């Protein structure tokens, strides 16, 4: 029914801790697999933290919050999501100070929020900039995802695709340097070819099919037209259908259907275009004028998809076709091609311009290999987004965790009060990240984690992390495990903000 008292906070901890214990071993390159018993007796042997929790049923609402916060991470950053839940579960797993010591959550939350400002400052100290102009460094950075994948045979290809693609979308002139991979980097697959044939189209590719053969097959100077209205007979304000029974009234309603569709098409062809792109559908009578005009018929193109076209070829959006002025012409466009590349038509309006958007062409030998190349390239685009938004990397392999933990432990010495105890407990929670990397490799956890903390005390904290493959210690200057800063800061805030959230819950109430 409901929960109240200390049972709530201790219950939310066991729920969040239980969800993290599932994916404790799903961290690093030597991640362990998980067996998911389907209801029909089947098994899925995935090792992805997002896919595991997505398929698991959870009864506690605290678990739904942990999972729903992880999904929000995937939309922004396709990496480090597993670290959020583990840290959020370890930060909450310290229930000694929470209940056994009878401290109020406001005392704990004030310490967790104080450490978060210190964890953020320490990560910027151990950071390091990157020369984004040199693509060789970004290759080593993007290899964190290409490693242990089938696309390693064309690893450099994936970097040049993702690197150059995000640079086109990056509109730095607006100050904030916003990037939109979902809209301005729309990806579409093309059957045929191989992995090497994968490239980036410098334009906008529409997957519209060819309905008739009377369409422009190859053009050197396209002329694209844009409009939102539909090419059909003007209906009434309501959706009332036209019901007719008298034959004499048919020719009247038919003539009204033909003339208005006729006059609207006559104005579209006055500019001598090569393709009519409309947002809404195009009826059969309207297509009879497009095939007669020897121009391509295109429809069902969204607003943002049309906005990129006007920036590419120089077209102009109009409400209706009747108001089409001479400005709506795609002069300077590269070419218009509706070739059937791999048993599927593809509209290419590429040009020699970068209209703050592009389209990625995924060539491949089969749908299985195409999907493998697809999901592997999206993460590379996001790593390029995170580095280009904030070109600062921090040492990975558990080094940034141990480096930050030493700063809090040394800073807690001057922390007079009861908040020093949970403030230090957050530092010991960061050690769980190398604790799992060492557990997966099989090396002794206590022996290496003890020596690992000693290296950060004496030697510089910017290096001396952990090697997940070998298990021994290694400097991140010698091993390119450097991860972005924006991923770690958002990973650290989301873990503390999530733990602060569940700690603020004291009564699970039902009602609507």
């Amino acid at each position: 029914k409901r929960e109240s008292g200390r049972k709530v906070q201790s219950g939310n901890i066991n729920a969040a801790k239980t969800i993290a214990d599932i994916i404790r071993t799903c961290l690093g390159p030597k991640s362990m697999m998980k067996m998911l018993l389907d209801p029909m007796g089947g098994i899925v042997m995935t090792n992805d933290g997002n896919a595991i929790l997505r398929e698991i049923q959870v009864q506690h609402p605290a678990a739904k919050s942990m999972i729903e916060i992880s999904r929000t991470q995937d939309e922004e950053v396709g990496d480090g999501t597993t670290s959020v839940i583990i840290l959020a579960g370890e930060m909450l797993s310290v229930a000694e100070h929470f209940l056994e010591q009878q401290m109020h959550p406001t005392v704990v939350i004030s310490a967790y929020r104080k450490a978060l400002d210190d964890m953020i400052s320490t990560l910027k100290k151990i950071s390091i900039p990157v020369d984004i102009s040199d693509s060789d460094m970004m290759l080593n950075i993007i290899n964190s995802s290409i490693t242990t994948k089938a696309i390693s045979r064309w690893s450099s290809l994936a970097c040049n695709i993702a690197l150059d693609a995000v640079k086109m979308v990056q509109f730095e002139e607006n100050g904030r340097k916003e990037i939109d991979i979902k809209k301005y980097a729309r990806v579409e697959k093309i059957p045929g070819g191989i992995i090497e044939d994968s490239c980036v189209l410098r334009g906008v590719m529409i997957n519209k099919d060819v309905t008739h053969p009377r369409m422009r097959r190859y053009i050197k100077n396209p002329r694209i037209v844009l409009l939102d209205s539909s090419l059909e007979y003007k209906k009434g304000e309501s959706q009332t259908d036209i019901e007719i029974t008298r034959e004499e009234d048919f020719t009247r309603i038919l003539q009204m259907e033909e003339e208005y569709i006729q006059q609207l098409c006559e104005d579209i062809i006055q500019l001598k275009p090569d393709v009519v792109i409309t947002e809404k559908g195009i009826s059969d009578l309207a297509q009879h004028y497009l095939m007669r005009a020897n121009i391509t018929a295109i429809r069902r193109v969204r607003k943002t998809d049309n906005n990129r076209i006007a920036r590419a070829c120089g077209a102009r959006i109009v409400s209706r076709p009747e108001e089409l002025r001479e400005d709506d012409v795609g002069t300077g466009a590269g070419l218009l091609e509706i070739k059937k590349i791999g048993d599927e038509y593809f509209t290419f309006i590429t040009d020699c311009k970068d209209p703050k958007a592009c389209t990625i062409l995924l060539r491949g030998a089969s749908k299985e290999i195409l999907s493998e190349v697809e999901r592997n390239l999206q993460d590379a685009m996001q790593v390029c987004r995170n580095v280009l938004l904030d070109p600062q990397l921090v040492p990975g392999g558990g080094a940034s965790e141990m480096a930050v933990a030493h700063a809090l432990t040394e800073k807690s010495k001057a922390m007079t009060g009861v908040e020093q105890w949970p403030y230090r407990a957050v530092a010991q929670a960061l050690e769980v990240i190398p604790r799992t990397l060492i557990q997966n490799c099989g090396a002794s956890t206590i022996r290496l984690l003890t020596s690992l903390r000693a290296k950060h005390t004496q030697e510089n904290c910017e290096t001396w992390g952990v090697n997940g493959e070998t298990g021994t210690l290694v400097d991140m200057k010698e091993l390119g495990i450097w991860e972005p800063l924006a991923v770690k800061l958002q990973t650290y805030k989301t873990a503390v903000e999530t733990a602060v959230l569940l700690l603020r819950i004291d009564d699970i109430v039902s009602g609507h």
Binding site: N14, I22, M35, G41, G42, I56, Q57, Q59, A63
Partner: protein
């Protein structure tokens, strides 16, 4: 540590569940390895009986009760699609690999350490296979030894000479001048009213 209407195996006993399934599937298929091996029956329930030693048929067509063992059955399907042979020996090696690993895992050894040894043993074992292979020319005397070695594992040592000469000649008719080969060129017909040893070739084609 679990939600209602569900279950979770936290400790290492979850690994023992998978080792026990492979050990059981090993003991099932080991009796049908080679020519002298026994046969297994496939009762469809409707009333159709079927005897065969092909491990791909004893895993693909036979539904397996244990959830973990059904995964290995899907691999035997994949194994049969590439080479068409070795599905039975694949399961026996998997059963013994996991068996030997449990001896060391019980002593406190992590699984990830053992798997790294398999990757090293594979490369050494893969390099040694290059030295043992015989790259001689394929003649009718050699393919008969291959066909006999492959057919004796599926028949009663009576249809050996019957199907051997037919299986070999069917291939030689569809390859010359180093041309790529395709088994779809050979049609497989079935007819009743004759003994099992009445198998023979048809240079042309049969129509219904």
């Amino acid at each position: 540590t679990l939600n209602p209407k569900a279950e979770v195996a936290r400790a290492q006993a979850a690994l023992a569940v998978n080792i026990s399934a492979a050990r059981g599937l090993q003991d099932v298929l080991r009796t049908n390895l080679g020519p002298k091996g026994t046969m297994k029956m496939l009762v469809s329930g409707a009333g159709d009986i079927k005897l065969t030693k092909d491990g791909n048929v004893l895993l693909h067509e036979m539904q397996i009760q244990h959830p973990t063992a059904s995964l290995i059955a899907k691999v035997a399907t994949a194994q049969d699609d590439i080479t068409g042979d070795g599905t039975t020996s694949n399961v026996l090696i998997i059963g013994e690999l996991l068996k030997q690993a449990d001896l060391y895992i019980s002593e406190g050894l992590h699984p990830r350490i053992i798997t790294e040894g398999f990757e090293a043993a594979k490369e050494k074992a893969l390099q040694f296979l290059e030295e043992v292979k015989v790259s001689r020319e394929m003649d009718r005397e050699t393919l008969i030894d291959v066909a006999r070695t492959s057919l004796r594992t599926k028949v009663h040592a009576e249809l050996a000479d019957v199907l051997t000469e037919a299986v070999v000649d069917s291939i030689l008719a569809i390859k010359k001048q180093d041309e790529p080969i395709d088994l779809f060129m050979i049609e497989i017909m079935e007819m009743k009213h004759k003994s099992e040893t009445d198998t023979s070739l048809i240079r042309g084609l049969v129509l219904d």
